[PDB]
């Protein structure tokens, strides 16, 4: 069976990092879970880009923050915060595609 991200993570969320960037934070329930995911090499730009309907090169960074058992995904905002046409000025509700993730382990 696969392990869903939801079963492994305490926090799965988005927010702005300033008006020009969107950050997705995932904090795992245990260090063991975090290390299992990091070791698997399954949380890739290709995975995230497919889930978000962007090109893989649009993912700017995936940062493995060991002190927090956390990973941060960074991408530019394709609508600057507050620009005409925005959907989410604070960048606060862009996390839902991550809820579909399942790991093959």
């Amino acid at each position: 069976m696969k392990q869903s991200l939801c079963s492994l993570a305490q926090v799965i969320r988005s927010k702005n990092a300033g008006p020009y960037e969107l950050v997705l934070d995932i904090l795992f329930k245990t260090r063991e879970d975090y290390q299992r995911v990091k070791r698997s090499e399954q949380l890739t730009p290709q995975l995230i880009a497919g889930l978000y309907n962007v090109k893989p090169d649009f993912i700017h960074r995936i940062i493995w923050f060991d002190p927090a058992n956390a990973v941060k995904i960074v991408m530019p905002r394709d609508i600057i915060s507050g620009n005409v046409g925005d959907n989410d000025v604070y960048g606060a509700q862009q996390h839902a595609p991550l809820l579909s993730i399942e790991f093959d382990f």
Partner: protein, 456 residues
């Protein structure tokens, strides 16, 4: 009368627009009258209450330019009911000014009659005490306090004021609040066409191509009255009149399709038939009219507070599943923080994607994957509404609901700023019949409009 009377209705409400080509084709059919409804109570009480149009000045001006240029050029009267959206004094004046500008820009001269529909409160107070007011169905009984706290009060005129203005030679007739069919029917009736057929024709034409199919609130229709019935047609090859589309419009916005009441009588449709004719046209016959003691419907609204609102989405399934309880907890938190103790503060939520449209009558009990959360606060002052809305917004944004995983914030706002001060809120306060009297007569005034303004 003799042979026929052709009425062109260009659009469902003056200002809604229409294709230029449809109007050009309609004019090639040589109308005897260009008539249009310019207002309605359906957009709600703000517009009468605040003295504002629900239609757009630029749209109204655009539509009238076509109509007045054509009417003056071809010596065809142009008749307008419920000027300016609600037909009270400010609405009538707003439309009047638009028409002066058209005459200035197109270098036109014509006579224009103005027919106000405003009713002084003293008349209504006196009628109430004299037993001359009747509530319509489900309307509360009228009180003196409700009269006094209303703003503009208007009566819906019938055919006769329009007829007196037309008989005096008015080329454009700008009526205040009016019964919709009357601005179409007044002229053919004075020319000898049957009252029941003409009023039913007006009722079917009062929203132009809404009575065609596929319908449009923004396309032209014509009724051709003869001495035995009337024919309905459109001027757009993609639209047709059918038996169902025309009959549907006989039902439209009425509480009994057999009996349609208005000032001076009731249309009895028990004997009517709808029959497809020609190509995409319908012939209607059998309509009749029963005179009744003459009464007018009054409309009025009153200010109830001030509104501040915000809209934001949520995409989180845990928040969505728990939303009803979350909103209650946020309200409790805000009331404690601001020490709220006024039962005159009203907070309303609409949860679009669950029950935003039907409320407690919505049959589906579960949301999907997203909600649009619309919050509005109505309070005795704008400042109070703003304060409550702001605190509800920031509290909801960061509320730590049970099992939350999306912990940086809960709401996707489309706009900066997030809160929208929408201002005064009105509610209907008068929707009652008044027995006609001399004091309620609707008198016209004709002015000569020229390219340089009104000339005396």
């Amino acid at each position: 009368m003799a042979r026929t009377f052709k009425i062109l209705s260009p659009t469902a409400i003056l200002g809604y627009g229409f294709p230029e080509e449809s109007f050009r084709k309609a004019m090639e059919a040589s109308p005897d009258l260009i008539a249009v409804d310019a207002g309605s109570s359906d957009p709600g009480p703000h517009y009468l209450g605040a003295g504002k149009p629900f239609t757009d000045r630029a749209g109204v001006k655009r539509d009238l330019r076509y109509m007045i240029v054509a009417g003056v050029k071809n010596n065809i009267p142009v008749v307008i009911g419920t000027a300016g959206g609600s037909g009270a004094a400010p609405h009538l004046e707003w439309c009047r000014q638009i028409i002066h500008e058209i005459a200035q820009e197109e270098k036109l001269s014509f006579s224009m009659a103005l027919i106000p529909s405003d009713v002084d409160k003293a008349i209504v107070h006196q009628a109430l005490d004299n037993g001359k007011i009747t509530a319509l169905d489900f309307v509360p009984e009228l009180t003196h306090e409700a009269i006094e706290e209303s703003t503009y009060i208007v009566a819906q005129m019938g055919i006769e004021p329009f007829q007196r203005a037309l008989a005096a030679g008015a080329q454009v007739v700008l009526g205040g609040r009016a019964y919709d069919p009357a601005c179409f029917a007044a002229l053919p009736i004075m020319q000898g066409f049957d009252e029941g057929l003409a009023l039913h024709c007006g009722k079917i034409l009062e929203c132009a191509a809404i009575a065609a199919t596929p319908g449009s609130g923004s396309d032209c229709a014509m009724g051709i009255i003869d001495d035995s019935g009337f024919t309905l047609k459109a001027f757009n090859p993609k639209r047709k009149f059918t038996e169902t589309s025309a009959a549907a419009h006989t039902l439209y916005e009425k509480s009994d399709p057999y009996f349609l009441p208005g000032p001076g009588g009731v249309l009895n449709l028990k004997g009517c038939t709808f029959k497809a004719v020609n190509e995409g046209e319908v012939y209607v016959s059998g309509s009749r009219h029963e005179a009744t003691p003459y009464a007018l419907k009054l409309e009025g609204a009153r200010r109830v507070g001030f509104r501040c609102l915000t809209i934001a989405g949520t995409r989180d399934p845990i928040m969505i599943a728990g939303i009803d309880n979350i909103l209650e907890e946020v309200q409790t938190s805000v009331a404690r923080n601001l020490s709220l103790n006024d039962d005159s503060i009203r907070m309303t939520f609409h949860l679009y994607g669950k029950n935003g449209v039907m409320g407690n009558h919505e049959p589906m009990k579960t949301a999907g994957h997203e909600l649009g959360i619309l919050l509005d606060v109505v309070a005795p002052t704008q400042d109070i509404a703003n304060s409550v809305c702001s605190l509800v917004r920031s509290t909801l944004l960061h509320y730590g609901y049970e099992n939350r995983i999306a912990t940086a914030g809960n709401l996707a706002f489309p706009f900066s700023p997030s809160d929208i001060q929408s201002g005064p809120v009105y509610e209907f306060s008068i929707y009652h019949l008044i027995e006609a009297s001399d004091a309620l007569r609707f008198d016209f005034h004709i002015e000569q409009v020229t390219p340089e303004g009104v000339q005396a």
